[model samples]
Target chain A: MIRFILIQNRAGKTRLAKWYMQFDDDEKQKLIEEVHAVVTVRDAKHTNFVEFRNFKIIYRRYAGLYFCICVDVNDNNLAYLEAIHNFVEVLNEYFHNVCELDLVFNFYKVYTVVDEMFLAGEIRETSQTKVLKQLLMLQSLE
Target chain B: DGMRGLAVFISDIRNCKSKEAEIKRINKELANIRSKFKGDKALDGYSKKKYVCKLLFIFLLGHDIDFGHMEAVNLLSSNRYTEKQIGYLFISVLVNSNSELIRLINNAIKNDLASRNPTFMGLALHCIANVGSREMAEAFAGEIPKILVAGDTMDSVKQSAALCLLRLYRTSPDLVPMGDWTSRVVHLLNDQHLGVVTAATSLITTLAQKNPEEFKTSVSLAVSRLSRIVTSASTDLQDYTYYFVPAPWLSVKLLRLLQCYPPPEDPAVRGRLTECLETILNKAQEPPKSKKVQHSNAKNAVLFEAISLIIHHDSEPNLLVRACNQLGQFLQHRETNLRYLALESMCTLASSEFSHEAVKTHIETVINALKTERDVSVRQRAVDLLYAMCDRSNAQQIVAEMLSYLETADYSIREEIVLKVAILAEKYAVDYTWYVDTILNLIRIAGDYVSEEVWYRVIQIVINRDDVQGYAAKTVFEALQAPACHENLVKVGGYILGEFGNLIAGDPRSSPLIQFNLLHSKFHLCSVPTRALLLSTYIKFVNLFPEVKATIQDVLRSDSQLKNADVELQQRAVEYLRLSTVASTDILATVLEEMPPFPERESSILAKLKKKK
Candidate 1:
C-alpha cells in the first residue's frame, strides 16, 4: 500500500525513516537523496503531490520538517496527505509541540508512535488515546 | 547498553568533512571490531551487543558489513528487549531475502513469536512484512489467523498480524490460502478496536476485489460499521475525531471497501447504506463558507469519496442533486483542492444520464475553470467535464469554448482538446456548415497536432451527404487561401476541391481553373506526402472538369511531379501522363475516378473513447 515514510529537515538531515517494501543500502540512500532533492526543490506554491518513477510522492512541510510518503500510483493521495497531518498532530500532542530537536533526542519514541498507528503499510489506527496508551506501555517495558 | 556510544558514532559520521574522511573513520572502527570478533576473544553478551550496534551503525551509513551479517541475524535469539530491536532493524534494512541467513532469522522469529509476549510477536510480524518473500509467507502464514482470531492473543499484536496477511496476500494470493480465512476474517471485521477494523478492512478490500463471491459475507459488516459512524457519530470513536468529524480515515475505508461488492443482498445492509450515505451528505451539508485548515482536508476526503460512491450506486435523483449542488459550489471554493476534487467527481458523474443532466447545470462553471484555473491538473479535468456534458443541446457552446481554450491551453492539454473538439463536432453537428467550419478551425489551430484520422472523418461526412458537398468544396477552397493554414487543412482542401470542383464549377466567380490555380499556388510549400495527394487531385480535375484538361495535363508533366525525387509521386505522374496522351477514354475515366462513399462503420473515435473508459 505504501513504499515508505521518510521525514527530514530542510537541511536534509533525517529525523525518521521507515520502509514498508524492501530496498538495499545503495538503493535506499539514492532514493533518499533523490526524494530530498525533489521535495526540497519546490516552493510553497507547488502542489502537495508529485508523480515519480512508479510511485506518487506525497509530501508536506511542517515548519522546518518535511514528511514524504511514497505510495503506489493507484493509491489515494488525498487520504494519505491527511494521514501525515494526523500523524504530526499525534507527535505534537505527545512531544509537547514536536520540533526537529525533540525528534533528534527521542528517536525510538517516534517508532513506538508510528507502530501503533501504521503497520506494514496501511494506517492501522487513528485514535490518540489508544495510540498514546500503547506508546507509554511499550515505553515502560525498557 | 552503548546507546551513548551509538549516538556519538552516528553524530561523528554525520559531522565528517567528506565521504572520504567518513570512510577512513569507519574503516578504522571496522578493523578493530573485526579483530575483536574473529581473534578468539570471547566477550560478555553486553560487549557482543555493543559491537553489533556499532556494526548496524556502519550499515546504516551506507557501508556493507558482509562479514558480520551473522552477528545481526544471531542477535534475533537474544533474550533482552533492547538488543532484539537492533536485530529486527538490521534485518528490515540490510539482510537479503534470498539469504541462508533468512532461514535462521525465520526460526528465531518463529521461536520468539511462540513466547506470548506482545513486543516479540508484533516485531516479528513487522519483520515478516518487510522482507515478505513468498517462502516466508508459507512458513509463517498459519500463525496469522490464530493471532488475529484466537481468544488469548494480545490486542496490540492483532493489527500487525492482519497487516502481515495483507502483505502476504499482495505477495501472492496462491501462497496465503483464504481457505477458511474466509470465515476467520469475518470475525475480525466486527472487531471492537477501530485499529483492527482499519487493518482488517484493508485486507478485506484487497482480497474482495479479486473474487467478491467469497468476500460476500463481510459486506454486511462493512455496511453496519459505516452506519454506526455516520448515523450516530459513535462515541466510542470520539478519540479518533479530527476537527468535528470522527475517524475520517476509517470512514473513507469503509465507504471504499463496500463499493467493491455488488448490491448487497442483505436488505438491511442495502437500507443501512443509503441511510449512511444521505446522513453523510446531510452532515456535510453545511457548506465550506468560512476559510479553513487541516481539519477541512480530512473531512472533505470523506465527503468527496462519499459523493463518488453515490454516483457509482445510481442513487436517486434528489440525492444526486444534492451531490451535484455541493460539487457545483465546490467549483469556486477558496481551496484549490476542493475545486480539483469536485471537478474530478463531476467528470464521472457527468457520464450518468440523469446525473449528466444534474452536472450539466454547472456548464458555465466548468467552462470558466477551463479558462482560468491555475492548477494544470484541474484544467485537464475541466476539459473532460465539457466533453462528457456535451450533446446536441449545447455542443456549439462546448465546442466554441473548448476551441477557444485550445489557443492558450498548455502543451500537455492541447491534444486532448483537439481530440474532444473533433469528436464533439462530428457527433452533434446537424448543421453540416458548422461542422465544416469547426473541423477547419481545429486543423488550423492544432496545426500538425491533428490526426490523419480526423481528416478522413471530414471527407466521409462531406461525401456521404449530397446537399453538403458543394458547400464543402467552397468552404475548403476558402480555408486554403489563408496564409497560416496547416498542411492538414491543405490536405483537406486539395482532396475535397478536386472531387467536388464541378459542384461549384459553373458559378462565374471562381471556376475549376481558379480552384486548380489556388491549390497549385500552395502546392510547392507542402511536404512530399501532401504534394503526392495533390497529384491525384490534379488528375481528378482532368476527369471532373475537362475545361482544365490542357492545364492539368501540362502541370502533371511538370518537373515537380514527372521528375520529382519522391518516387511515389513520380510513379503516379508517369501512369497518368501516359493515360492522358493515349486514346482510351474508358481507362482515363476509370483511372481518374472520383472517390466512392466510405464504407459504413462506427466512428473510430468512439473506439478510442471506449479504450479510455
Candidate 2:
C-alpha cells in the first residue's frame, strides 16, 4: 500500500515524482520538504523507515540522490526498500553506471524505465532485463 | 569537433565562480546555438547533433530551456538514435502538460505513436505518460485504450500503454472508464508478458479501490488468478533470475487485494477460505532446503502476507490458532525483524477472544522478550502481549513481576506498568485487606510513577470498606515504620489514623498522642492536602486523648504549615484550633464525625476485565 515514490537529490530538487494516491500540490511539497529535512541528516550506511502522519517513509541514499517512498504504516517496508535498490540497479544497467547527468540528459528514458518498474506507485516489473528491453525498444524507436 | 567544444564549455560553465558569471557565459553560448539553429549549420553531423543534445540538456538543467524547446522538438524528428532519446528526455523534463509548446509536438507524437515502429511508439507513449495534458489526452483518448488491450501490440508497448493510463486517468478518468476498459484490464491480468500483467494489476487495483462497486463482478476472477500464482511453484516460463520464487511479489499484491474482499459469512465460503489460507501458509513455510537469502526473503514475504490475511479474515478460530502457533515460532528467530513481526502478529492474535488462548501459552516467551528485546517497538509489543494476556488467574504474579521492571524500565513504560498494576489489583484482588496491603506496598515503591487515579482507587476502597478499617489501620502504621514511604502513603495513612486511631491507641508504641507525633514528624514532607489530613488527624487525637492536648497544641502551633499560603490549609488550621479551644470532647467528636459510607460501586477498571466462568 505504498502511496508515493519521490526521487530527489541532496539539494531538495525532485528528479522523479510518482504518486499512487491523491495529494494536493501543497501537501506534496510539504512532504518533500519534511522528508528531506528529516532524512538528509542521517548516516547513509543503513536504511531508515520513519512514521509520519499516518504513513511511513522508507528511504535509502546512493551518492547524492535519495529514494524516498511513502507507504502505509503497516505495509512491508523491506519490500519497498528492496524495490528502491532494484530501481537504482536497473538505472545503472540502462545508463552504464548512471550519474546525475544521465538522469538529467536522459530523463525520459529514466521515467519510462521507472514507469515500467512501477505503475501508479505499485511495483510492475521485477526483472531488470525486461525493463531494459522495454526501454531500449522505446529509446531508438526504429 | 563541436562535441569537444561542448564538453569544454560544460566544464567552463561548472568552473564559473559566481552564478551571474555562469549565466552570462550560458547566455552567450545560447546566442551562438540560437544563430546556428536559425541558420543552415544547425547540428547536421551525428557528432554535432550529440553536441547540441548535450547543450540542450545543460539548458534544461539550468532552467533555461525556454529557447531550446523548438530545437529539441526538431531533434525529435532526427533519424539518429541518440538524438531522439535526448530529444524525448529534454521534452519530458523541460515541458509539462500545461506548456504551450506541447501543441507544437502534438502531431509529431501522434505520428510517432501511429508509426509501424514499436520503438517510436514507445517514445511517444513515454512523452504522453510524463507530459501528456488534457490536449494530449483528447488526441489519444480513443487511441490509448485500443493500444492498452491490442493483441497486436508488443509486450513493451502494451505495458507502456497500461502505465500511461494511470496518468491519463488522473487527468481525465472519464477517458478510461471501468465499463470500457475493466474487462480489458481483467483480460490483461493473464497477459503473457509479466510486465504487462504487473502494469495491469497496478492499474486495475487502483481502479478497484477507487470504485469498488465496479470491481465486484471482476473480483472473483482476480482472486482465482491470484490464488493460482500463490499456489503455483513457478508460472514464469521465462525463468527470470531476479524473481527467485513464483511471482512472490504478485502474491504480496494479491494478499493486499484480498483485504478489500468482505470476509466469508457462509460456512461453505469459510471452509473454502480455510483451504486457501492453509495452502498459502504451507507454501510460505515450505522447506527452503537451502539457506539462500532470496529464498528466505521470498518466504518471509509470503509469510508476512499470510499473517496479514489471517488477521483480517476474522473467522475460523482454528485457523487463527494454527497461524498463531506458526507465527509464535517466529519469535525465536535470530533476525530482529522476524522476531518483531512475530511479536506483532501475536499482539493482533491476543485481541481475538478465540485466539487469545493460543497466545497465552507464549507468555513465557514474551516475557523473555521483555527482558532481552533491544528494539524499542518490539519491547513495547512484548509488554502489550503481557497486558493483553493478563487475567484473574495470573494478575497477582504478573503485577509483582512488572513492578520489578518498573525501576529499570524506560520512563515512558514505567507509567504504563504502574497503571496496569493498579488495574490488576482492582480487578483480581481476592480480599479487601490483601488488596489494601498490595496498593500500600505499590505506593511505597512507585507512588510518583503511579497515576493519581490508580492510588485514589485504593483510597476509595478503604473508604467503602468500613469493616476493614482496623486491618487497614494496622497496615498503615506498620508501613509508617518503614525507612522510605511515599507521600501518598503518608496522606492516606493520616486519614486512616484519624478514622481508626482508637484501634492503635492501646499499644505502647502507638499511643494516640504519639501516633499524632509520628504524623507531625512527617508533616514537613507531606503535600498541601496531606498536611491538611495530618492537621485533621491531630485534632481528632487531641479530643480522644486529654493527655496529649498540650503536645498536640505545641506541634500545631510551631509548624508554619498551619499558616501556609494555601487557602484551604490556612482555613482548616484556624478552624481546628478554635474547635479544640471552645468545644467539648463530645462536641469535637460530633463536629469531626466519621465520613459518609461510600457506595458499593464497581470500578470502571473491572468492567473491561475478563473473568473466567
Candidate 3:
C-alpha cells in the first residue's frame, strides 16, 4: 500500500503532499527532506526506486517537478510508476497542457482530481479519461 | 464580498516577468493583506477563505506565511461546505500536527466532526489525519468510533473516519485503545461499499496484528468476503471493477490482512479460506484474457497476493503446485512486473517442503531472469530467488551463474550479490578446495565490492582446515600472477603464501622465489593495509624459505618500506626486520603460528541478509 505522495519541485519546495498513513509531524517533515535529497541528486540513468526504511521511495522527474510516492517494499512498483504518469496525463488534459503553474493555481482542483483518481490511498479508477470527466464536473462544485 | 478574490493573486504572481517582479508583487500583496486582516471590520468568512487559499498557494510556492492561519481556522466554523473544505485543505497542508493551533481550535473541530453532514465530517476527519497530533486525537478519539460503527453514517463518511481512526491510533495509539474496537470495527468488513470495506480492512489488519487471536471473526469475514469475490462478487461490484477484474484492490487487501493472523480454528472459516484460495489459484491458470496492462495488473494483483497467503498458511499440494506452475509461466512472461512479483513470491514458496520440488523445474528460468531482466530490481529479485532455492545439487550452477552476473551487475546491488556468492560457496562447500577457489575468484572479480567479514571468513576457513590450506595458497598464488587483480585477492594471496607457501614451496612454478616475485609486483600498487600484510608476508617467508632471505630483506629496506612516512608501514618494517634477524628461533612461529581457529559465530555474509527474510 502507498504510505504517502509528495510533489516537490527542483529547489526542494513541496508543491503538494498527501499522507495516507499517520506519521509524526517531525517524521513527515524529515521524510520530505530525506526523499528530496535522495531524489534530486540522482542521475536520470538511476532507477526510480530508492530504498528507504521498509518502503521504496519511488520517484519520477517531470520537467521541474518530482512526483514521488512511498510504498511497501513488496508493492507493485511498475503499476504505481505508471499511475503517476497516468495522473500527469490527466492533469495535462484537465488544464490543456498543464505545468507547475496549473498545479499552483488550481491547487484545490488537484485534490478534486485526486479524489476521483484515488480513494483511501489506492487507485480508485484507472481510466484517465474517466477521471478526467470527474475532474471537469468537480470544477463546478463551488 | 468586497474582496472575494483568489484569481487576482494567482494571476498577479503568474504574470510576473522575473523573480524580481514576483517578489515585488508578492510583497505588495502581503502589505495589502496586512491591512485587510487588521482593519476595524474583519473580513467575512468567504473573503477569509479566499485569503487562506492564496496563502496556501503562496506558501506552496516557497513564500513565508506569517499570518492568516487563524483566518483559515475561523472558516471552519461556517456552515458553508466549500468554506469549510477550503479551510481544512489549507490547514492540512500548512499546519503541522504538533502545532498549538489544534488546541486553540479544539472545540471548532469537534463541532465539525459531529456536524452530522458526511462531507463536513470527512473534511474534518482528513484534517485530523494530517494536522491533529496526540492531544488533538484524544479530544476527538471517542467521537470517531461512534461514527465508524454507527449504521446511519454514510460510507463516504465512514471511509475517511475509519482511516482517520487508523491515523489517530498511529499518532498516539494509547488514545484509541483496542478495547472493543475489534468486535465493532470488524463488521465493516461486510459493508456494502467496497471503499469502506477496503479502508476498514486496512484498519483491521493493523489492529488485528498486535493480538489477532480474538479477531478470528475478522478472519472469517475476510475469507467469506474473498470467497464471494472469487464466486461472482464481480457482477455486483459494477462500479469498482477495473477492466472487469472486480475490485482487485479490495481482494488483495483481504488476502494481505489474512497474513497477519494464523489460520482460523473455526472449521467453516478455514474451509471457506481454503476454497477461496483454491478458486484464486485456479483462476490464474486462465486469467481474464487481456492485452491491456490494467486488466492484467488488476487480475494478477489479486492472484499474486492470494498466492502469498497460500504460501503462508496452507501447504496443500493442489494449491501449491498449481501456483508454482503458473508462476513458472510468469517467469517467461513479457511483462517485467509479472516476472518480478512472481519471482519474489515463488522464492518464498520454493523454500518450503511442499512446493520445493515443484519450483525446481523452473530453476533454469530464474537463471535466465537474472540475465534477461532489464530492471535492476528485477535482476536482484532473480538473484535472491536463486540464493533462496540453492541446495547441494544446484549450488554449483547457481554460484557460477551469480559470479558471471557479478561481472556487470549494477553498483547499487553488487555488494549484496558478492555476499550471497560467498554465503553459497561456504554453505554448500563440497570439496573444501572448491570453496577456496570460488572465493578467490569472487575477490578477483569483485574484491573492491567485497565486505571485510566475507574476506575474513575465507581466510578463517582456509586456516582452520589443513586439507584446503595448501590448495588455497597455490590457487591464490596463481591468481596473483595476473597483471591486474583486486586488492582483496592480492591480500589473500599474501596472507596464504605467508603461512602455507611451504606446502608448495618445492615446486619450481610456485616456489618461494616465484611467490615473493608475484606478490611484490602488486605491493607497490597496493593500499597501505594490503602493503602492510605483504610486509608481514615477507617476514613470514623469511622463516619458511630462507633461500630468498636477502631478496626479502632488500625489498623491506627500500625507501617505501623501512623509512616510509606511513608510520604503520615503518613500524611493521622495523619490527619485521628485527624479527627476520632471528627467523630460525621459535619466537616468529609462536607469534604467527597459523591464526588460531576462529571461534564459530554467524557468518557476516548471512548476517546482512537477515532483512530479506
Candidate 4:
C-alpha cells in the first residue's frame, strides 16, 4: 500500500520550502487541509498536488516533522512547463542554478493494466508483449 | 299421345279419386311403380317400354335423376367401375346441368359416404376428389368428428371416415383452413388405427403442399409427438408404423412440412430442437431387424424431411454437414425414396451461398470418390460433382487430374468428360495459361469425337492467349465464320482480351509496349475493359517513371504524337505533369516525355516542366 525510494538532494526539504515556506505554518496547514479534502489518495503517507496544468506532484511527510516533495511531469504538463518557465524567469531575475527534481508519477489509473494482468483463462509460453497480444486476441486458444 | 294422353290419364285419375281413400290408392300405385325394377334386362326393358317417353316429361315435372350417385354406390359395391370411372361418375353427378342437382349429389355423397364399408369409403373419397366442392365439403366436415370419434366401430366405417376426410382436405383445401386443419391432424397423425394414420399422412401432405405457413407449426408438433408414439406404442402399433406406413406418402408429407418450416433461427430454439432431432434420428437408425424398432424408426421419412428443413434455414455449414452426416447415417436406409430425398436436400444445400466454401474445401472427397467408386453410376455422379467444382477455387489444383482423366478415361465417359473439360478450359485459360497445353493435349486426344461444347471451349482457350492464339486463330476464324460457333467465339474472344489486358496493365513486369498492347486489346474487347486498362496504365506510368524528372521540359512542350492526344486523354496525360511538380524532380521529367500533353492541359504540365530541375 505504501512505498518509498531513499533519495538525497543538495536542495533538501528546507530548500524545497522556499516559495512554499513563505506562508506561515497556520496558512500551510489550511492549504494542506483544503488540498487534502479535494484530493483522492491510495496511500496516506504521500499527498499529490493537482493544479490547472496536467501534472501531479507527490510529496511525503518526513518523520512526521516535515514534507519532502517530488515533481514529475512527463511532457506538456504543469510542473515541467512551470519549471521551465519559472527557471527562465528565475534565471532572468537571479541568474542562479536549479535542482533536477523531476520524477515519474503513477497518477494515471491502471484498470487497463489490471485488465492486462487479469488472466481470465489463457495459456502462453511467457509474459512477453507478443504473448500478451496473442492471449488477449484469443489466438492462444489455438 | 302427348298432352291428350295425360288429359285422358287425368280423367282416369279423377274417376279413381271419386272413390273413398283415393290418396291411399295412389300411394299403393306409387309402390307398385317402385317395385317394377327386378334387377336384370327387365328393368331396362321396362325403362325402354315406359320410362323413355316419360323421362322428358319427368324432367319437365322437375324430377332430377341423381342416377349417377345411385348407380355409383351400386357399382362401387360390386367393383363394377374402376376407381377413376367412379370418380368421374361422382364428378358427373356433382357437376350437373343445374346447380341444384350438383348440390343434391354433393349432399347425397357426403351423407352416404360413411356407410360401414371400405369399398364405399374408397369410392366416396375418390368421388369427393372429383366433386371438389367447398360448400359440400365444409358441410361434410361437420360430420367428420362424429365418424372419426366412433372409435373404429366398423373397419369399413373407420376406413371410409379416414379416406373421406383425407380426400376432402385434398380436393377442397378451402373448406378446412390449413392452420386449423393441421392442428386437427396432429391427433389423427398418431391415431391408433393404421388407416387413420395413413389417411392423416395423406391429408397432412396435401395441406403442406397447399399452405406451408400452416404446415410448419403442425409438422413440428406432429414430429415431436410421433417420436413419443414410436417410443411407447405397443409391439403391434410399432410394426404397423415400420412395415405398413406408406413410404412415399409419408416421406413426401415430411418433405412438404420441411420446405416451409425453417430450422431454429435463434440459439435457444436451435439448442432445444437440435437435441430432440438428434435423439429421434438416433432412435430412427435402429437396425430394421426388430419390428418394433423398425416401427419406431418409421420416422425415417420424418427425419429426412426435418434435415431438408435446415437447408436454407441453417446457414452454418458445419451444423448442416454434421446434421446430414448423422441423419444420413442413422437412416442408413438405402431406400431409393430416402436416397432421392437426401439427394434433393444436398442439391438445395449445395446451391446455397454458404455452401460454396464447403464444396471447395471438400474437393478431395469428390475427387477420391471419382477414382475409387466402383459403381459406374456412382462414378458418373462423382464425375459430375468434381466437374462442378471446376468453376470455384476448388478447381485450382484439380485441372491436371481432370485433364488426365479426360484424355485417358474409357470412351464411354467421354461425353461428360469432354463437356466438363471444355467449360473448365475456357475459364481457367485466363489465369493458368501454363495449364493450357495440358488441356489442349486432352482436346487433341479426344480429337474429332469431342463434343461441340468441348471444341468450342478449346477454341475459346486457343483464341485467348498470345502464344496459342495463332495455333487456334485460323481454326477459330473458320469457326467464327460458322454462324453457330461465331457468336460464342466472339463473346469468348472478348473475355480473353479483357483478361489479357488486365494482366498487361497490372503485371509488375509490364513495359510501355505491354501498355500499348493492353490498350489495343481493350479496343478488341470493346470500350470497357480497355478504358479500365488505359486508366490504370496511365496512372502507373505517371506515378513511377524514373525519367520524368530529366526531360520534364521537352516532354511537357513536345508537339509529337503525344501532344495531340484526346482531351480527356490529355487531362490524364497532364496528371503526370501535375504529379511531377509535386514529386521530387528526379522521377517527374522522364515520365512527362513518355505521355503527350493535352492542349487544354499543357499550361499546368509546362509550368511543372519548367520547375527547378
Candidate 5:
C-alpha cells in the first residue's frame, strides 16, 4: 500500500501532503526531507525507483515540483508512478495548465482532487474522465 | 479563478492576529450561510454554494466548527450535483457511525446505492468504506453481496465495495462469514479491472490471515491465479500487467500461503508448480529491456516471490542449488537492493544442511563482496554468510580475515567480529598451544575490541593447561614487555605471572627484576583492575625470589604506586604492606603460594555445562 504522497519544489518546500495513516508533524517533515535528499541528487531524466529505509520512493519530476510516492518496499512502484502521472494529468485538466501558482490559490481543490483519485492510499481512479467528473461536480457548486 | 478565490480566504485567516477572533468570525460566517440556505431560495446559486462549501471546509478542517451535521445532511438532499458532492465530502469527513447524524443519512446512502447512476453508487460505497460501522454492516450486509456479484455494477463501484467489505469485516466480522465471502473474493481474482483485482487480492489476503482454513479451500484456485500472474509475461495474462505491476502484494501473499502448505505430494501438481517457478526465475534472469515502466518492477517483484518460494517451500537438492545460483548472480548485480536481496536469501539458504553445500561455492564471492560493498546492511549480511559457513577446516583463514576486518569495520560490527574470532579459535584450534598463542596474538592486534568473556575464557584455558602454562606465561610475559600491548594483555600477563611465576622465573628471558620493571612501567597505563593484578604479581614475584625482597619492598612503598590509589587498591596495598612488615618470609611464601594447579578437567567440565545450559 502507498503509505505517503508528497509534492515539493526543488527548493524542498512541500506543496501537497497526503497520508493514508496519520503521522506526527516531526515524522512527516523528516520523511519529506529524506525523500528530498535522495530525489534531488538523481539525474532529472532518471526517475527510476529508489529505496529509503523500509519504504520505496517512486518519484517523477513535473516541471519544478517533484511528485513523490512512498509505498511498501515490495509495492508496485511503476503503478504508483503511473498513478502519479495520472494525478498530474488530472491537475492539468482542472487548472487549465496546472502550475505552482494554480496550486497556491486552489490548494483545497487539489486536496479534494487527490482525495477523489486515491482513497486510503490506493488509486481509486486511473481514468481521467471519472476523476474529472467528480472533481468538476465538487467545483461547480463552489 | 484558481487558488485566487481561496487565496483571499487563506490570507484573511493568516492576517488575524488572534486565533480566537478568527474562529469567532468563521462561526458567524457559517451561521450567516445557514440562515441564507433556510431563508431565501434566491441565495442558491453556483458561486454561493462554492463560497459556502469553502467556508464550511475551512471551519470544519480547522477543527473550529462543532455543529453542522444536520446542515450537511440537508445539503445531501439538494437536487444539484455539486451540492451532493460537498455534502458527501462533508459527511465522510465529519460523520461517524456513532454520530447522531449518521442514522439520518442511512436512507440517503441506501437510495444512492440503489440508484442506476454509477457516480452515485461510487459515492455511496466510498462513504460506506469510510464510516461504515457494525450497525451499518448489519443493516446493509445483503445490499453489498448483490452489488459485488452483479456484472452490471461499474468497476469503480465494485472496487469500492470490495474495499468496503474489508471495512465491514473489521466492524463486524461475524456479519460476513469467511466461507460465504471467500469464494466471491476468489471469483474477483479473475476480474478484468486492475483496481478490482487489487482490491480482491487485498481482501483475500486479509481473510486468509483471519480464517486460514476457509482460505485453504481456495488455495488451488488462488495458486492457479497467482501462477498466471507469475508467468503473465509469456502467457496471455500479460494484458493486465500492461497498466501495472502484476499485483506484487497479491503474489507475495500467495507465495507466503503456499509456503505454509505441505509441498504437493502429487507429481502433477508439483510439476506444475515447478514450471511456474522456472518461468518466474527465467523472467527474473532477463535484464528488463522494455521501456515499459512496469516491466522491471514486475520482474523484480516476481523474482523476490520466487526466492521466497524456494527458501520456504521447496527443499529439493537440485532446486536449492539452482536457487543458490540465481541468488549469487543477484548478489553481484549493480543495484544495492538486488545485492541485499541476494545476500539475505543466501543467508537463509546457508542455514539448511541440504543447501549449505551449494552455498559453499559462493563463499569466495561473498567474502570478496565485503571488500567493496559500501552499504552497511549488505556488508552485515555478507558477514553473516561468512560466520554461518565457517567450520574447523576453514576457521583459521576466516578468523584471520575477520580480525583484519575488525581494524577498519564499522564500530557496530567490530564487537561481533572480535567475539566470533575468539569462539572460532577456541572451538577449532587443533592444538592447545596454538589456541593459547591465537588469543595472545588477538590481544596484541585488537585487545580493546576483545570482550571480557573472551578474556576470561583465554585466562581459564591457560590456567587449565599447566603443560602449556610455562609456554603461555612466557608468551604473555613477552607481550607485556612490548610498548604497544593491549591493556587486556597486561591484565592477562600479570595474572599468569601471579599464578605460574615459578614456571618462568629462572628462564634467561624472565627474572624478578624484569617482571618488576614491566609491571612498574605499565602500572599507571593499565586500568585499575590490571593495576591490582600487577600488585598481586609483585607479591608473587617476591615469593618466587626472596633474593629480590629489598627491591620489591622499595617499589611497593613508592607514593606514585598504590598508596594514593582507589579504595580497592588502597586496601590491597595496606594488607600486603602488613604482610611484608609483620609476617616472616616463609609465611608470606605460604600465604601467596602458587595457586593450586587449576583442576584440568573441572573448569572444562563447568564450561561445557555452562554452554549446555
Candidate 6:
C-alpha cells in the first residue's frame, strides 16, 4: 500500500502534488530505465539536474518504496506531472491487473476524481471524494 | 365563416386531386376567395397571414406547385407589394410550405436580405435547407451573384450565404454557380473560430463525400484540418455527440468513399482516408502493449478515436488491433475516462471474429498489461478483456494462465480476477463451465452487487444456447421460477409471443420494434428506414440469400384480397410470409384466411397501415 497527502494551492502554496509512488531502489531503477527509453540522454541529464525538479528517488533511513512525486502548478497548466501521472497509472493497470504481475514499478495515484473534473472542466456534483490517502494506507496497513 | 371558407377550399382541393382540369377550376376559385379580401384587411395580422400561409404550405406540400411561376405571377410580382413584403411573403410562404422550393427561397432570401445582417442570413440559409427543392434552388442561384458581393459589412450574410451555397450545391450536384463562390466557400471553411471551423468541416466533409472532383483543390487541407480537429479539439467535440453527431456522419462519407464512392479510382483520397485511419488506430489501442501518456498533448487520443470509428465502420480487425496497440501505450493516463475510453475502445474492437492466433496475441498483451498497470479500473478492463479473449479460443493454456491469478493473489487482485471469472462463466458458458460451487465463488466476489447489464448478457447467452423449449420443459419440471432474467428477456419473450401469437397471449404493442424490424427487413415494400439501413446491406446480403424474398410476390399477386383484411396486419403478415414469390394468389388466400380483414382502398389502406405500424 502507498500513503500520500496531496497539498492544495491554499495557504500560500501555489503548487499541487497529485501523486507520489513509493517504491524501493530496484523499482526506481526500473522506472528510470523505462522513462529513459522515451527521453533522450541530454534531456534525462537536464531533467535530473533541475534542482527541485526531482524525478529521482532518495535512498533514505526509513527505507521506503521509492518516492516519485509528480508536481503540477495550478496556474501554469504545464501538463507535465499530469502526463507522468497518466503514464504511471497506465503502467500500473497494465502490469498489476491485465498481466497480473508484481514488483515492476507498481503505480498508484493519490488524486481523486474531483481533481480530474477540475482538470477536464466538467461540472462537479454534490458528492465529492474525501482526501484520505494516509488514513486509507494506515487502516489497510498489515 | 373562415372555417367555412377553409372547408370550401379543402373540398375544392379534394376535387383538384381527382383531375388537373378540376385543379385549374379550384385554383380559379382560390383566387376568387383571395380577391374577396383586399389590402391589409385581406391577410390581417399574424393569424390571417398564418392561415393563408398554412393553406399555401399545405398546397405546396400536398401537391407539386410550380413555385417559380407562383412567385413570378403572384408573390414576387410588383402587384401592389413592397420589396420587403415580397421577400417576406416568399420567405414566410416557403418557411411554412412543404415545397423543396423553401430551401431555394431561403437561398434567395439570404442573398436579398444578407445585406442587412449575417445572422439573419444564416438563419434563412439553415431554414431553407429544410425545404429541399429545385425551384427554390433556381431562385437561390439567381441571387448568388449579388450575394458573392454582399461584402464584409454584411459579413454574416456573405458567410452564411457561402454556407448556404455549399449546402445547396452539395445536395443538388448541378446547382452551385461555378466561379468565385467556390474558393470563397473554401476560405470560409478554414475560418478562425472553432464553431465556424467545425461547421465548415462538416460542409467540406459533405462535399468530400459527394463531389471531390469539384472541390479537389481544397481536399487535402480540409482532410488535414479535420484530422487536427479530431486530435486537438477536446473529446467533447471529437466523437459523435448529441448535438453535433460528429465523427459518424463526418466519417461515414469517407467510409462510403473508401468502400464505394471513390472518384474514378483516384487512390490519393483513398490513401488519405486510409492513412487517417492508420493514424487513428495507432492512437486508440489500450491497457497492455499500449503507450503511457506521460504527456497530455492528446495527439494519440485523437488519432486513436479517429482510427476506431474508421475501423469500426470498416469492420476490419487487423486495423482494430493496430489501433488497440496504439492505445495500449496510453494506459498511463491521468483521467479515468481516458483510460476507460481506451479500454472500451479495445473491447469494442475485440468484438471482431477472432482466430486462435489472434486470441493468443491479445492474451500475451494481457500478460504484459498485468506486469505494469496499477490503476484498478484500467486493470479491471484489461482482465475483463483477458477473460473475453481466453474464452474466445478456449485454449487450455490461456485458461490455465487466467486461473493462476484467482488462486493466489491479494484480495483486490483476486477481486478483479473473480469479476472476470464471473463474466467468463456468464458469457462464455459454451466454452467454459459454470460449476454450482463456482456460482458461490462468483456470488462472494460480487458481494451482493453485480453489473446488471453484464448479468443480463450472461442470462441471454444461457437462454440463447439452451433450446428455448428446453427452458419451457425445465420450467414445467423443476418450477425453476422461469429462470430469472433481466428486462432483455422481455424483448425475447415479446418476440417469441409475436412469432407464436396463436400459442400465447400478448399486446400488439408487445412487438412494436419487431413490427418495424419486420417491415424494415422485408425484401419488398421499401420504406424510408428500410431504404436507410438495409437498402445497401440488402443488395449485398440478398444475392447470397436469394430464397429470402421468393414468397413476396405471392402477397402482391392477391394483394387486393389481403387488402380487404385489417389491411395493416395483413400487409405486415403478407410482407413476412410471401417473400415476394410468384404464387401471390395462394399467399394472399392464406393471408386473408389467417389474418384480420384487409381494407380495400389502396391509398387509405396504405395510409392506415402506415399509421398503424
TM-score of each: 0.91, 0.70, 0.87, 0.42, 0.72, 0.32
Instruction: Please tell me which model should have the higher TM-score, number 4 or number 6.
Output: 4
- Model 6 lDDT tens row, B347-411: 55555663334434556656656544554445556665665556543634444455555554456
Spell out the clash pairs found in candidate 2.
A141-B119, A141-B120
Ranking of all candidate structures by their TM-score, best first = 1, 3, 5, 2, 4, 6
* Model 3, runs deviating above 4 Å: A6-15, A19-54, A57-68, A74-104, A112-142, B1-4, B96-100, B287-291, B508-510, B517-525, B549-562, B580-595, B608-613
Model 2 stretches with alpha carbons more than 4 Å out: A3-70, A95-116, B1-214, B233-235, B239-243, B265-272, B424-448, B460-518, B525-563, B566-613
What is the Å distance of residue B420 in model 6 from its true position? 11
Candidate of highest TM-score: 1
| Model 3: share of true interface contacts reproduced | 0.08
| Residue pairs of candidate 5 with colliding backbone atoms | A105-B3, A106-B3, A142-B50
True contacts kept of each: 0.53, 0.24, 0.08, 0.00, 0.09, 0.01
